[PDB]
Design a protein around this ligand. Structure first.
Ligand SMILES: Cc1ccccc1-c1nc2c(OCC3CCCCC3)nc(N)nc2[nH]1
Lengths: 258, 297
């Protein structure tokens, strides 16, 4: 209901910058790497499926983890523990029926105890100072989707996939804000399915132009093309389900001609 | 951590926790403390507290209760709020013999709509507006409180929890099982509360979901496809619903002047899409002369 669409868009645009993880954080992590993070995040995608969790939940969890790691140095043996707690918190915040803590202790093949997961939860809350209501690519996509004319849910499902793919590779996507990745995602989806471009209406709304999206778009397009060969594959599997009109089964465009 | 706070008395009980009045021994400030027990062994920090805190920190506005601090322990979690002196419900009951003066009704409704627009403009639903959760101070302020059921929403919304809003103040799109609901559900709550300030009794005191619908219908008319495109499709719509004629609004809340009736009528429009937004409400001619009287506690 548009009476608040602009006010909210404005707000998320302010807040995304306040809730943004610190871009070079992995360099300062002495024992973990981009590649460990990919693994963890990819696992999270898996957990999301098992428990039929919302995509929003995935995206918040990722946000939490990246923020947590921007100030808390963590050993690889404990990365999953952070992951688990983020996901739990994300579920609590976003889900109608979050899975119970016992279920979270389950999916970590008994690596951690309930008491640990609960303690870690408390520490993530303390570190993120309870600021959990963070803007996500999803929230941006969803608004952009109001500008398709007409809706094509092949496009919508395709954008969600691309968006989601970006969670996995902190290099390079950690340096782009959600609103911008949403931008690229939507444009790339739109182009692939229908051959149209980032609408003029979205220029007016977002201030972003094809020009301003180019950097991120290049990164994304490449990620799309190399998706079949990526080390992590949970998202591709997920996005074959009829639920998302098997969009992962679509061929990425060879060129963008920007 | 609480070394500095001095308990004065219990005030009551939340969507959880116990609430106390306390003073800060060093600054003299009077606060309300919401105390939540946690454990380990169980389910960790309750999602109500997670939401209430996270949302309440973003919502900083003069007609929204101020969350001042959050105190952690292993086992205990304390939410420190600004103290406010009573709630609307307590107030209305005290105003038994005299009624609440119209300039004060107007002030209170203006401020609630201010605070509610602020929530809505930051993608928050209150989902539990009622006199018990509207707090008033000794200087004319009234403030939204108890964000226990509040939630952050997206544009467009998706399906959120159904078991939502206290019965008497529940919007009909919820009672009818509609898969989406939004901001409009909070405005309906204000609508009801606005009528309740005037008449001092509750507008629709139903004791079940069916009784509650029937009360709405007998006042506003049974909605059909003309008043509300789509109703005859909704999950809990029944074609056997009695069809009641809409009652003339002057009869609904007799003491209201023409402007008041207009406002109230739009706040209770059945079709959520056409129902009024808090934002739009603040420009309504009802408020042309609004001031800010102090009440009498
Ligand atoms: C509600 C009330 C009645 C009489 C005296 C004081 C209060 C009161 N409750 C407060 C409160 O908590 C009220 C909240 C507690 C859970 C039920 C919904 C309202 N917070 C703050 N900051 N001030 C309050 N004052």
């Amino acid at each position: 209901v548009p009476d608040y669409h602009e006010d909210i868009h404005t707000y998320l645009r302010e807040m995304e910058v306040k809730c943004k993880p610190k871009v070079g954080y992995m360099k300062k992590q002495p024992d973990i790497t981009n590649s460990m993070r990919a693994i963890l995040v990819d696992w999270l995608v898996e957990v999301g499926e098992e428990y039929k969790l919302q995509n929003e939940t995935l995206h918040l969890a990722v946000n939490y983890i990246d923020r947590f790691l921007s100030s808390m140095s963590v050993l690889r043996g404990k990365l999953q523990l952070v992951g688990t707690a983020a996901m739990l918190l994300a579920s609590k915040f976003e889900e109608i029926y979050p899975p119970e803590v016992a279920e979270f202790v389950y999916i970590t093949d008994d690596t951690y105890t309930k008491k640990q997961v609960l303690r870690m939860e408390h520490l993530v809350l303390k570190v993120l100072t309870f600021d959990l209501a963070a803007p996500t690519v999803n929230q941006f996509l969803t608004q952009y989707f109001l500008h398709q004319q007409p809706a094509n849910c092949k496009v919508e499902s395709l954008a969600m996939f691309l968006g989601e793919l970006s969670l996995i590779d902190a290099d390079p996507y950690l340096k782009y804000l959600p609103s911008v990745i949403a931008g690229a995602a939507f444009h790339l989806a739109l182009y692939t399915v229908t051959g149209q471009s980032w609408p003029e209406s979205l220029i007016r709304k977002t201030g972003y132009t094809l020009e301003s999206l180019k950097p991120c778009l290049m990164d994304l397009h490449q990620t799309y093309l190399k998706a079949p060969q990526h080390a992590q594959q949970s998202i591709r599997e997920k996005y074959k389900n009829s639920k998302y009109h098997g969009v992962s089964l679509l061929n990425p465009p060879e060129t963008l001609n920007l | 951590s609480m070394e500095n706070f001095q308990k004065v008395e219990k005030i009551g009980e939340g969507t959880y926790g116990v609430v106390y009045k306390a003073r800060n021994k060093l600054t003299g400030e009077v606060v309300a403390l919401k105390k939540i027990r946690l454990d380990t062994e169980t389910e960790g920090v309750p999602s109500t507290a997670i939401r209430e805190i996270s949302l309440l920190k973003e919502l900083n506005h003069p007609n929204i209760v101020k969350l001042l601090d959050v105190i952690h322990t292993e086992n205990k979690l304390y939410l420190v709020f600004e103290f406010l002196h009573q709630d609307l419900k307590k107030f209305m009951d005290a105003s038994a013999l005299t009624g609440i003066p119209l300039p004060l009704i107007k002030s209170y409704l203006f401020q609630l709509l201010q605070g509610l627009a602020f929530c809505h403009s930051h993608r928050v639903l209150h989902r539990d507006l009622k006199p018990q959760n509207l707090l008033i101070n000794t200087e004319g302020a009234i403030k939204l409180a108890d964000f226990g059921l509040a939630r952050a929403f997206g544009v467009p919304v998706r399906t959120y929890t159904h078991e939502v809003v206290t019965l008497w103040y529940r919007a009909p799109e919820i009672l009818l099982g509609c898969k989406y609901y939004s901001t409009a559900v909070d405005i309906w709550s204000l609508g009801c509360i606005f009528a309740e300030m005037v008449t001092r009794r509750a507008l629709f005191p139903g004791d079940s979901e069916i009784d509650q619908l029937f009360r709405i219908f007998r006042t506003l008319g049974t909605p059909d496809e003309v008043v509300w495109p789509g109703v005859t499709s909704m999950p809990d719509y029944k074609p056997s619903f009695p069809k009641w004629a809409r009652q003339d609004f002057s009869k609904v809340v007799p003491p209201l002047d023409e402007d008041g009736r207009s406002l109230l009528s739009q706040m209770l429009h059945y079709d959520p899409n056409k129902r009024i937004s808090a934002k739009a409400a603040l420009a309504h001619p009802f408020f042309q002369d609004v001031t800010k009287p102090v009440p009498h506690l």
